[PDB]
Amino acid sequence: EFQINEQVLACWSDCRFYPAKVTAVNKDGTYTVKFYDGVVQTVKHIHVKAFS
Amino acid sequence: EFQINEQVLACWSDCRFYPAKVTAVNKDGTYTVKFYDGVVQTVKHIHVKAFS
């Protein structure tokens, strides 16, 4: 699992991945993440990738 | 623009496209669409593709 303040690739509405910061790790297996533009999204662990 | 009851490809949380039925065309340039499994989503016109 990725941890708070870590960056990941998260999927946006255009079906592309962009870097997002993990702002919360939830016990249900989701993350809250925030894109560079400040847009927040809740996503399942399986739907984010490592950002390197 | 796609019309009601037409099928399109719409993006889901796994960053893949799947066929969805248009159930409403909104004046703000979005569609309500429904995937085969009955999951409903509102999406911008620019974020769906033709399904053929």
From Swiss-Prot, chains A, B:
* Coiled-coil residue spans: none
Q: Which domain of life is it from?
A: Eukaryota
Tell me where it resides. Nucleus
Regarding how it is modified after translation, the entry says: Ubiquitinated by TRIM26; leading to proteasomal degradation.
Q: Tell me where in this chain the Tudor domain is found.
A: 1-52
Phenotype upon changing C15S: Abolishes homodimerization
Tissues of expression: Expressed in heart, kidney, liver, lung, pancreas, placenta, spleen and testis. Not expressed in brain, skeletal muscle, colon, ovary, prostate, small intestine and thymus. Expressed in colon and ovary cancer cell lines while it is not expressed in the respective normal tissues.
Q: Signal sequence: where? A: none
The function of this protein is: Methyllysine-binding protein, component of the MOF histone acetyltransferase protein complex. Not required for maintaining the global histone H4 'Lys-16' acetylation (H4K16ac) levels or locus specific histone acetylation, but instead works downstream in transcriptional regulation of MOF target genes. As part of the NSL complex it may be involved in acetylation of nucleosomal histone H4 on several lysine residues. Contributes to methyllysine-dependent p53/TP53 stabilization and up-regulation after DNA damage.
Q: What's the record's remark on domains? A: The Tudor domain 2 mediates reading of dimethyl-lysine residues. The Tudor domain 1 doesn't bind dimethyl-lysine residues, due to an atypical and occluded aromatic cage.
Give the quaternary structure. Answer: Homodimer; disulfide-linked. Component of some MLL1/MLL complex, at least composed of the core components KMT2A/MLL1, ASH2L, HCFC1, WDR5 and RBBP5, as well as the facultative components BACC1, CHD8, E2F6, HSP70, INO80C, KANSL1, LAS1L, MAX, MCRS1, MGA, KAT8/MOF, PELP1, PHF20, PRP31, RING2, RUVB1/TIP49A, RUVB2/TIP49B, SENP3, TAF1, TAF4, TAF6, TAF7, TAF9 and TEX10. Component of the NSL complex at least composed of MOF/KAT8, KANSL1, KANSL2, KANSL3, MCRS1, PHF20, OGT1/OGT, WDR5 and HCFC1.
Recite the other comments. Antibodies against PHF20 are present in sera from patients with hepatocellular carcinoma, glioblastoma and childhood medulloblastula.
Protein name as annotated: PHD finger protein 20
